[PDB]
Amino acid sequence: WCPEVRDRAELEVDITGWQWWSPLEERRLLPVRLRSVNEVREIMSKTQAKKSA
Amino acid sequence: YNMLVFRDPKRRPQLSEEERAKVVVNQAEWPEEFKDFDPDDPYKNSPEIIKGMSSWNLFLWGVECAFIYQFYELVFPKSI
Amino acid sequence: DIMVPSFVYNKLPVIHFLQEKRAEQKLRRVLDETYTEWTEELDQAHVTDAITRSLNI
Amino acid sequence: MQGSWSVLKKNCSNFFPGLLAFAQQTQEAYGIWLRIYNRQQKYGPTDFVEQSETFSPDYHKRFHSQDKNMWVDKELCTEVSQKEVARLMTYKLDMWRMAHCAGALLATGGYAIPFGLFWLANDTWVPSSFNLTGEELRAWREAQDLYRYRSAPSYLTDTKWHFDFHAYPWNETQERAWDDLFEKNDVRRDPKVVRPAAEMYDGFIKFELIRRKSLRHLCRSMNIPTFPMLARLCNGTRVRDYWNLAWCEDYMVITQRLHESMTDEELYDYAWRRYLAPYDKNLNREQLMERVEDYFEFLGPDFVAHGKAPNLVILTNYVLGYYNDPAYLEGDISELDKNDYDHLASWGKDAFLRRLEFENGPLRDQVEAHTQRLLAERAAIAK
Amino acid sequence: VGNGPTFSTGGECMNTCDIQNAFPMNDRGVRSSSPFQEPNTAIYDSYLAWTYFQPMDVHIEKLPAPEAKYYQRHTKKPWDVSSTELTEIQSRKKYFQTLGYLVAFIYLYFLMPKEKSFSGLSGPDGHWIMLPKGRPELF
Amino acid sequence: MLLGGFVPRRFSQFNRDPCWMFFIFSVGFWLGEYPAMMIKYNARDLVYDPHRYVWSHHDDHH
Amino acid sequence: VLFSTYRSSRLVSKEFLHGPVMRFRALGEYYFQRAWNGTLNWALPGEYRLYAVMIPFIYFYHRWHNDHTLDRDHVEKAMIMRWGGTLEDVRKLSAKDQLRVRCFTDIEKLYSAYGPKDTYLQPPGDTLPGKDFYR
Amino acid sequence: VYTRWKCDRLPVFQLKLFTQEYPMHAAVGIFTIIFLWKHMSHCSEETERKYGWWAGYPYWRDPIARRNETKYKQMIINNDVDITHPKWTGCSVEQLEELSRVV
Numbered sequence A: 001w002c003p004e005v006r007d008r009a010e011l012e013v014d015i016t017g018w019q020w021w022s023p024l025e026e027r028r029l030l031p032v033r034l035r036s037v038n039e040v041r042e043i044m045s046k047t048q049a050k051k052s053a
Numbered sequence B: 001y002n003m004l005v006f007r008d009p010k011r012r013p014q015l016s017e018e019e020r021a022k023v024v025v026n027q028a029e030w031p032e033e034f035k036d037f038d039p040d041d042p043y044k045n046s047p048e049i050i051k052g053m054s055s056w057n058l059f060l061w062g063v064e065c066a067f068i069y070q071f072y073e074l075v076f077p078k079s080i
Numbered sequence C: 001d002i003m004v005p006s007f008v009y010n011k012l013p014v015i016h017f018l019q020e021k022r023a024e025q026k027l028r029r030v031l032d033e034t035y036t037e038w039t040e041e042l043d044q045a046h047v048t049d050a051i052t053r054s055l056n057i
Numbered sequence D: 001m002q003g004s005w006s007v008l009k010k011n012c013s014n015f016f017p018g019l020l021a022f023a024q025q026t027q028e029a030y031g032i033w034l035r036i037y038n039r040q041q042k043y044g045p046t047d048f049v050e051q052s053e054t055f056s057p058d059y060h061k062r063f064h065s066q067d068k069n070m071w072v073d074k075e076l077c078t079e080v081s082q083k084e085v086a087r088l089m090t091y092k093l094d095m096w097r098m099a100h101c102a103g104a105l106l107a108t109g110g111y112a113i114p115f116g117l118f119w120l121a122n123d124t125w126v127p128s129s130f131n132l133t134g135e136e137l138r139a140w141r142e143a144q145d146l147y148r149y150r151s152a153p154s155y156l157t158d159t160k161w162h163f164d165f166h167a168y169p170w171n172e173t174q175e176r177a178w179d180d181l182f183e184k185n186d187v188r189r190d191p192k193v194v195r196p197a198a199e200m201y202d203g204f205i206k207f208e209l210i211r212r213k214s215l216r217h218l219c220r221s222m223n224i225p226t227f228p229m230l231a232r233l234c235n236g237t238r239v240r241d242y243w244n245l246a247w248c249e250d251y252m253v254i255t256q257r258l259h260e261s262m263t264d265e266e267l268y269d270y271a272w273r274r275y276l277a278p279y280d281k282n283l284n285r286e287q288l289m290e291r292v293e294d295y296f297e298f299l300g301p302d303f304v305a306h307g308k309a310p311n312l313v314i315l316t317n318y319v320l321g322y323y324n325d326p327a328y329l330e331g332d333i334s335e336l337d338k339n340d341y342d343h344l345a346s347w348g349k350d351a352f353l354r355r356l357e358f359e360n361g362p363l364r365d366q367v368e369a370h371t372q373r374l375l376a377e378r379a380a381i382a383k
Numbered sequence E: 001v002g003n004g005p006t007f008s009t010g011g012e013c014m015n016t017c018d019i020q021n022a023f024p025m026n027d028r029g030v031r032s033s034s035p036f037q038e039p040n041t042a043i044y045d046s047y048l049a050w051t052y053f054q055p056m057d058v059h060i061e062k063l064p065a066p067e068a069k070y071y072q073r074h075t076k077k078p079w080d081v082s083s084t085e086l087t088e089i090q091s092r093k094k095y096f097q098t099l100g101y102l103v104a105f106i107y108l109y110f111l112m113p114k115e116k117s118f119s120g121l122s123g124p125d126g127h128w129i130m131l132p133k134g135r136p137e138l139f
Numbered sequence F: 001m002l003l004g005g006f007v008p009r010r011f012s013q014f015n016r017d018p019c020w021m022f023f024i025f026s027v028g029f030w031l032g033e034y035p036a037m038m039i040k041y042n043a044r045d046l047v048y049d050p051h052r053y054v055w056s057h058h059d060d061h062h
Numbered sequence G: 001v002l003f004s005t006y007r008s009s010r011l012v013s014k015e016f017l018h019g020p021v022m023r024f025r026a027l028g029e030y031y032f033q034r035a036w037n038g039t040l041n042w043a044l045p046g047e048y049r050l051y052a053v054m055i056p057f058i059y060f061y062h063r064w065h066n067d068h069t070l071d072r073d074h075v076e077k078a079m080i081m082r083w084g085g086t087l088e089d090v091r092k093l094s095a096k097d098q099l100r101v102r103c104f105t106d107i108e109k110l111y112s113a114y115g116p117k118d119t120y121l122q123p124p125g126d127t128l129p130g131k132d133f134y135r
Numbered sequence H: 001v002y003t004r005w006k007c008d009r010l011p012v013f014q015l016k017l018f019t020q021e022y023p024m025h026a027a028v029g030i031f032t033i034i035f036l037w038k039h040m041s042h043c044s045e046e047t048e049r050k051y052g053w054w055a056g057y058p059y060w061r062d063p064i065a066r067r068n069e070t071k072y073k074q075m076i077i078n079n080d081v082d083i084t085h086p087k088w089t090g091c092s093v094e095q096l097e098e099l100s101r102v103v
């Protein structure tokens, strides 16, 4: 019932990817999180200014 | 505690002292198996697997098995 | 029967976490691209002015 | 695809007509290749004709270099048409498989006959010429697509895992390109967003440094026979030749806009030879055109300007991403209401399990407080 | 609550492992033993520390069942075997293997005599094989 | 790896788990075989083989 | 075409011997599939009870094999060589005599290198039979 | 998705493992097996007597002699060998009869 994880793990192991830690990808994705409303307001203002100019 | 090399695991505390002090203990809700619970002897009140079968009885059973293993040929020897 | 299964089982948590983060990233990108477009329409005052001029006033 | 008796009968019936058609195609393709080779030798760059050597920086092993050993003949349309190039590519695939089978036959004498029976029972490694009707051709294409589905995910996973484990992207745009490159075919990938991955991987690995296992996976995904694989510079040469022909045809089509005038079936075949459009997807002309335009966009303006395509590894991954179907999920959600460890219910809980339940259960705070207070009292008494 | 197992840990403590970030942290500050959220995760201190999760009866707001269209993916292939089917196959195979190994162990350690016994009462003394037959010219 | 499990606090608790019951039975066998050997092999009526000097492993391996 | 290379080609139904298999898996899982059962390279588990149960059983069956199959050969050789050099000569004795001889062999085994050497070295002047008794 | 370990059957996975994953190791192992069976697959009767028996060679019945006797009897009977031939004995049949009458 979580097929993507299963397929990725099985393929990684079948291609000699035994290791179970990926520090680099985690570092790229660790700080990802849904933004707050104020952050959304700031981003929308930035986009509107960019479109205007 | 330890029994030879086997050490009894201990649960790490998770509550702080302030929160812990506010906890009200009610042993009435606890199961009869664990009342007056003691970390140094948590299985004192635990039920026996077989009623009336003591640890010493099993120890003596093993000793008797050894005695049989060593003495049976003395009483019922067999030819080559 | 023993080794590959164990290493797959070890892999599962990290992959699950990374895929959840990836989906959150997709949702965040979807939200971030939304901007309200305020359109500008010809002011009716000029229309009124042109109407007056047509009257020869 | 697994072998079957029906396919065995089909191939046995069409064996000799298939051989005759293969011989005719061999003559035609030899003519086409003679024209192309003469043109390459006459007008080719000095490095391409002289076969300049490019060695790895670690073990100094020679391999084809994309920039030097690959050349796009922009003026090939004068001598050779697009259809001739497609025919040559198809014949190259069929000839590769036939040559491997013939080598096995010559090596093992008459002992390859049962292996031949196994071979004719499956359409995976038989030539296209063995199909004399539309239904047979459809089944053969289905078998090829099945093999591609079987092989491609391993290649994609190899590439992605190696890069992610041993390296990370430099900038955010590269991160986005890398992440979106390996998405499933159910979503549409923007070639402009994905292109920087080519330069990033050129920084990591070029086609001249491709490893032998990754090469084996790629050749599997391209329906290229791999046994005997041998050194990596043989199937590597096959891959280089096939993609050089594909790039020449792509330049011809882009310059002459032939795909717009190309018919539906020919367009589908053109996309298929690029590993963009599976036949089992039942794509229409709109989807085929979208995929072909995305492929051309991924090639980039520099391809037309100078005949330089992006990194071949990344290009192969991008095109094979269309065979990376979403992971299968079958079964109604109601199945999640069941239990998996009912067979253990008869065993119950032992003393240790009861202790764990008591300590970590809803009464955990009370037990923790009582235990800590008792320990503190005992420590105070000891002191 | 039942006695069933949970997501395997390997006897590891997730608050100090190399992939600890992949395990969610609860209010008490104890990282979960699984990618799932666990409220009552604990740590036990033997010679080495190990994390534990005790199953309990907890109610969770259940989102209504979606449609099959939005979560079913019919990309199954003839070579594909599901994890449940694989588990069934391996369970049966290991059951039969266990029976065979049990029989073999019994025969070896309680019935099979050792070869080349001094008295000759038990076990074979060896013999020759592949001897020529019907080849008078050989001699 | 010796991480956890039932651990009886003293002898009397070995009967609180079947596995430790079997363990204590085995320990009883182990320790009680020694007194049996003491009694059997230090018996008054035990007699050395008269023909013990006829043959020995020492001459065989030599 | 004759045999499938894929494990998916089933030879039996999914429900074949479901119950016994579930019982066997219940036996396997109850003690092993636990957080504290962390193995060291799959060979050394973390559950104490596994050691407590398996060490005695292994020792018991190994000892039974050694006593009834391996040391028996040495005992029989001693009996044969010391009492005629032939199996029939030994069988000419009574069960009690064989018991005495075998227990003397056990004595010799227990002494090993840490004991008196008169058990195999004949002191000068001893009246007991020598090595050439049966020759 | 397809994986060799999960989808292929055991013999197929074995062949794949020892042909495309550890082929050199398999080749070396086969070489060593051939060497062992070509140079370390013989045991003389004296060696068997010295070390070939758990408690020692039981000279009182000489099972090696019985084994060789059975071997030679079987060979002679099956192959129809005339052990009285001059080459085996080094003398003519008449000389053999004369010797038999003498002794």
Ligand SMILES: CCCCCCCCCCCCCCCCCC(=O)OC[C@H](COP(=O)([O-])OCC(O)COP(=O)([O-])OC[C@@H](COC(=O)CCCCCCCCCCCCCCCCC)OC(=O)CCCCCCCCCCCCCCCCC)OC(=O)CCCCCCCCCCCCCCCCC
Residues within 6 Å of the ligand: D026, D029, D030, D033, D095, D096, D097, D098, D099, D100, D101, D102, D103, D104, D106, D107, D228, D234, D235, D237, D238, D241
């Ligand atoms: C009787 C003796 C037998 C001896 C034992 C043999 C044992 C078996 C071993 C295999 C033998 C060959 C089998 C037949 C192969 C078919 C012919 C062929 O080469 O096909 C092209 C094709 C070339 O592949 P490629 O990757 O495209 O080549 C890249 C080049 O850059 C390509 O260059 P390019 O890009 O410029 O393109 C050129 C292309 C352009 O042309 C075209 O595009 C037109 C098509 C041309 C090729 C058509 C091939 C058709 C194949 C099918 C034939 C019908 C089969 C019917 C089966 C059913 C029958 C009932 O034309 C070519 O393909 C020319 C290739 C070069 C010629 C190779 C032949 C050399 C040997 C023959 C001469 C021998 C002389 C002996 C003199 C003796 C003196 C004492 O061949 C292959 O697919 C390769 C073979 C695959 C199997 C390999 C197995 C291992 C081999 C190890 C050999 C080691 C040495 C021998 C000792 C072995 C000890 C263990």
Ligand SMILES: CCCCCCCCCCCCCCCCCC(=O)OC[C@H](COP(=O)([O-])OCC(O)COP(=O)([O-])OC[C@@H](COC(=O)CCCCCCCCCCCCCCCCC)OC(=O)CCCCCCCCCCCCCCCCC)OC(=O)CCCCCCCCCCCCCCCCC
Residues within 6 Å of the ligand: D001, D002, D003, D100, D101, D102, D104, D105, D112, D113, D115, D116, D117, D118, D119, D120, D121, D122, D124, D125, D227, G001, G002, G003, G004, G005, H011, H012, H015, H016, H019, H027
């Ligand atoms: C008339 C025709 C036209 C003319 C002729 C034309 C030319 C024809 C020839 C060329 C054809 C080429 C294409 C062939 C394609 C098909 C290949 C194939 O076999 O596919 C698998 C094929 C099924 O294919 P499929 O179902 O279509 O699936 C294909 C998929 O795509 C799956 O695909 P995949 O890629 O996953 O599968 C690949 C798989 C292929 O492999 C397999 O799948 C394994 C096949 C065998 C499995 C057997 C399982 C059953 C075992 C039973 C055991 C006995 C049971 C008890 C019997 C009791 C009987 C009383 O793995 C491999 O490729 C491994 C390659 C290994 C290479 C080995 C190289 C060794 C080199 C040695 C080292 C040298 C180093 C250098 C040394 C240098 C020193 C100087 O397998 C079978 O059909 C199984 C047949 C089993 C037969 C019965 C069992 C054996 C019977 C033996 C009888 C012996 C009698 C004599 C005894 C005498 C005693 C004294």
Ligand SMILES: CCCCCCCCCCCCCCCCCC(=O)OC[C@H](COP(=O)([O-])OCC(O)COP(=O)([O-])OC[C@@H](COC(=O)CCCCCCCCCCCCCCCCC)OC(=O)CCCCCCCCCCCCCCCCC)OC(=O)CCCCCCCCCCCCCCCCC
Residues within 6 Å of the ligand: D100, D101, D103, D104, D107, D108, D111, D125, D216, D225, D226, D227, D228, D229, D230, H010, H011, H014, H015, H016, H018, H019, H020, H023, H024, H026, H027
């Ligand atoms: C639980 C227990 C179960 C039972 C277990 C049984 C016991 C097993 C114990 C040991 C197992 C491991 C042994 C490993 C040994 C070391 C291997 C090694 O070092 O390999 C390095 C290396 C690794 O191979 P690779 O190319 O890198 O990739 C291998 C992958 O498997 C390629 O995979 P891929 O995915 O990349 O490609 C897949 C696909 C890709 O598709 C294709 O490639 C298209 C189709 C290609 C067809 C074949 C083309 C061949 C072209 C000519 C090759 C050169 C010939 C040289 C001259 C002839 C020498 C004899 O290829 C295939 O489907 C190949 C089908 C082959 C089917 C045959 C497999 C063997 C089954 C048994 C049949 C023979 C039984 C004999 C004994 C019994 C007799 C009564 O080997 C080679 O370079 C291959 C050289 C092949 C030379 C020819 C064979 C020499 C061996 C003696 C043959 C004797 C024939 C006797 C006939 C009958 C006489 C009565």
Ligand SMILES: CCCCCCCCCCCCCCCCCC(=O)OC[C@H](COP(=O)([O-])OCC(O)COP(=O)([O-])OC[C@@H](COC(=O)CCCCCCCCCCCCCCCCC)OC(=O)CCCCCCCCCCCCCCCCC)OC(=O)CCCCCCCCCCCCCCCCC
Residues within 6 Å of the ligand: D060, D061, D062, D063, D230, D231, D232, D233, D234
């Ligand atoms: C049942 C059949 C049994 C058969 C047994 C025979 C052996 C197997 C047969 C063949 C099996 C099929 C597969 C073979 C391997 C394929 C390799 C491959 O993929 O190559 C692709 C490759 C094509 O790629 P490419 O891009 O065109 O060029 C490669 C790049 O240059 C690559 O660029 P790169 O960057 O890699 O450049 C480096 C490259 C550069 O090399 C090349 O690639 C160039 C081609 C090779 C040149 C080799 C000759 C070098 C000069 C020799 C000078 C000797 C002087 C001695 C004077 C003595 C005076 C008394 O490699 C080297 O540097 C290696 C040099 C060789 C070093 C040899 C060291 C040996 C040490 C010996 C130790 C002691 C031994 C024991 C004691 C002995 C004494 C008591 O193929 C070749 O280049 C040539 C392939 C030749 C295949 C072998 C043909 C076999 C013919 C057999 C005939 C006899 C049969 C007897 C039968 C007996 C009864 C059964």
Ligand SMILES: CCCCCCCCCCCCCCCCCC(=O)OC[C@H](COP(=O)([O-])OCC(O)COP(=O)([O-])OC[C@@H](COC(=O)CCCCCCCCCCCCCCCCC)OC(=O)CCCCCCCCCCCCCCCCC)OC(=O)CCCCCCCCCCCCCCCCC
Residues within 6 Å of the ligand: H030, H033, H034, H035, H036, H037, H038
């Ligand atoms: C119908 C079968 C094929 C017929 C022939 C076909 C055409 C020819 C094929 C190729 C011939 C190669 C010739 C030699 C090339 C160069 C190498 C060399 O120097 O060779 C020396 C020598 C050959 O002598 P020669 O040079 O021809 O000249 C004679 C000299 O005068 C002798 O001078 P010497 O001083 O060297 O003599 C010492 C001794 C030297 O002999 C040896 O050292 C024997 C070495 C055997 C190597 C086996 C390689 C494969 C190993 C696979 C992995 C096994 C792992 C461990 C498993 C343990 C538990 C089973 O020589 C012999 O007496 C040779 C007898 C060889 C008999 C081979 C029988 C193989 C049985 C395999 C059983 C596998 C059971 C697996 C059960 C699994 C169940 C789940 O040994 C070998 O070549 C050994 C390899 C033979 C391979 C044959 C083809 C594959 C196997 C087919 C039969 C399979 C039967 C399965 C039965 C299953 C029962 C349950």
Ligand SMILES: CCCCCCCCCCCCCCCCCC(=O)OC[C@H](COP(=O)(O)OCCN)OC(=O)CCCCCCCCCCCCCCCCC
Residues within 6 Å of the ligand: G001, G002, G003, G004, G009, G010, G011
């Ligand atoms: C190719 C033969 C050509 C000539 C015709 C021979 C017909 C003989 C009569 C057969 C009657 C019983 C048939 C029963 C069904 C057999 C189905 C079968 O072959 O399945 C193979 C099966 C393993 O199947 P699996 O690999 O898991 O996947 C199969 C799907 N691809 O494997 C098994 O489970 C084993 C099943 C064995 C069944 C008996 C096979 C006997 C074959 C004898 C051939 C030799 C000639 C016999 C001539 C007889 C004349 C009277």
